[PDB]
Amino acid sequence: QAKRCTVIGGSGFLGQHMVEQLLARGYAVNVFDIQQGFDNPQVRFFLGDLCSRQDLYPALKGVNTVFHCASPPNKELFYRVNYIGTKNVIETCKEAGVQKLILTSSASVIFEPIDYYTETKILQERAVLGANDPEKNFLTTAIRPHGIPQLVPILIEAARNGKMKFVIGNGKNLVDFTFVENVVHGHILAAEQLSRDSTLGGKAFHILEHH
Amino acid sequence: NQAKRCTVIGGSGFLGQHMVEQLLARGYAVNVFDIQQGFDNPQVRFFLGDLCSRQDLYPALKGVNTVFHCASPPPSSNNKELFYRVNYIGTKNVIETCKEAGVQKLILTSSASVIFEPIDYYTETKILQERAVLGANDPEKNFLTTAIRPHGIPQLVPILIEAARNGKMKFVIGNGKNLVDFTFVENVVHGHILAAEQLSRDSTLGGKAFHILEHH
């Protein structure tokens, strides 16, 4: 019964899709943002600032996964949204008895000049990854898609030990997917695979291609 | 400039095709070793023969700086021992001819499914082929090797790969505005090339496998 979830940034470019893919999978999606980006069926929309617990908790109690995707299109404007409000997303994900928080960070963070927007995406990710807590039944994960600047990682070493963990999917069904749709399929697969293996907990993750 | 000479073993193939077209754009000399002459262009010396023959192959490599190997049989063939011929033994012969001609770097085009360690004998040969190639990284001899692992030259596919704590994961930077236009194949070529132009700057990348991130 507990396969319910919630998207922060559902009014964004990616949240839109996140929800889309998520409903098809058979999921009671709840959307939380500051505006109403569009209308959709079977998705209770919640509105409010993410920095406020008081405007947020209504949107989280009941669900077992939170997809945090929020990001604006400026220090305080970048600091408060990605840092201050994420710490509140962490604080009230615990209160509302959520079990699985999936952060949508970037790929620029693998760079250790780095802009300020990315200064806040490392701060954010660390926060989210720091809060991994299998004991209090709270597993967090970060996912690094590129884009939604002018420097991007093309290739990543795959350690020859098999020391690195990796997420497996079935590409026979997603033969028709687009770039954005693969960013979502990434978030979801980790999400549902967190529910089996707590040792994805704490880990950032890059997305691979599939022809 | 005798450091821009380089050869695309398997250069008549679909990936090989694009490999040479892009490598001509950045001012490389390109021999091409394969079997047929595929789709030709009057700026390439298309050698050809047998991949496993020391002597078909040596003239194709003598004089050049960088070898780009991507000669793999179609995984659809399922001629079991063919995969063992071409991917394994052939590559060994690639490896030694590359040392027998003092070739500086070798970029092998691997398979993303070699990460799966009920698997195709194909992939098993693909793993053999990479341990060899990555096992011949002799920085002192100044022979440097890598393998790139593309996905579409299939029941299981790797969607996500753990990013390490810090430092224990190498990566190749690109300038991600000129390649929003590139097709998938064009980017995969731009991957091997950047690998190669970086194996010169840092000997750190030698002996290491790579996957291809999603973009554009």
Curated annotation (Swiss-Prot), chain B:
One of its GO terms (biological process) is hair follicle development. Brain, heart, liver, lung, kidney, skin and placenta. It is a single-pass membrane protein. GO terms for cellular component: endoplasmic reticulum; endoplasmic reticulum membrane; lipid droplet. The active site is at residue 122. Coiled coil: none annotated. Its EC number is 1.1.1.170. It is an enzyme of class 1 (oxidoreductase). GO terms for molecular function: 3-beta-hydroxy-Delta5-steroid dehydrogenase (NAD+) activity; 3-beta-hydroxysteroid dehydrogenase (NAD+)/C4-decarboxylase activity; 3-beta-hydroxysteroid dehydrogenase [NAD(P)+]/C4-decarboxylase activity; oxidoreductase activity, acting on the CH-OH group of donors, NAD or NADP as acceptor. It catalyses: a 3beta-hydroxysteroid-4alpha-carboxylate + NADP(+) = a 3-oxosteroid + CO2 + NADPH; a 3beta-hydroxysteroid-4alpha-carboxylate + NAD(+) = a 3-oxosteroid + CO2 + NADH; 4alpha-carboxyzymosterol + NADP(+) = zymosterone + CO2 + NADPH; 4alpha-carboxy-4beta-methyl-5alpha-cholest-8-en-3beta-ol + NADP(+) = 4alpha-methyl-5alpha-cholest-8-en-3-one + CO2 + NADPH. It comes from the Eukaryota. Keywords: Acetylation, Cholesterol biosynthesis, Cholesterol metabolism, Disease variant, Endoplasmic reticulum, Ichthyosis, Intellectual disability, Lipid biosynthesis, Lipid droplet, Lipid metabolism, Membrane, NAD, Oxidoreductase, Phosphoprotein, Steroid biosynthesis, Steroid metabolism, Sterol biosynthesis, Sterol metabolism, Transmembrane, Transmembrane helix. Pathway: Steroid biosynthesis; zymosterol biosynthesis; zymosterol from lanosterol: step 4/6. Its main location: endoplasmic reticulum. NAD(+) binds at residue 126. It is found in: Endoplasmic reticulum membrane; Lipid droplet. Catalyzes the NAD(P)(+)-dependent oxidative decarboxylation of the C4 methyl groups of 4-alpha-carboxysterols in post-squalene cholesterol biosynthesis. Also plays a role in the regulation of the endocytic trafficking of EGFR. It is linked to Congenital hemidysplasia with ichthyosiform erythroderma and limb defects: An X-linked dominant disorder of lipid metabolism with disturbed cholesterol biosynthesis, which typically results in male lethality. Clinically, it is characterized by congenital, unilateral, ichthyosisform erythroderma with striking lateralization, sharp midline demarcation, and ipsilateral limb defects and hypoplasia of the body. Limbs defects range from hypoplasia of digits or ribs to complete amelia, often including scoliosis. Homodimer. Belongs to the 3-beta-HSD family. This is Sterol-4-alpha-carboxylate 3-dehydrogenase, decarboxylating.
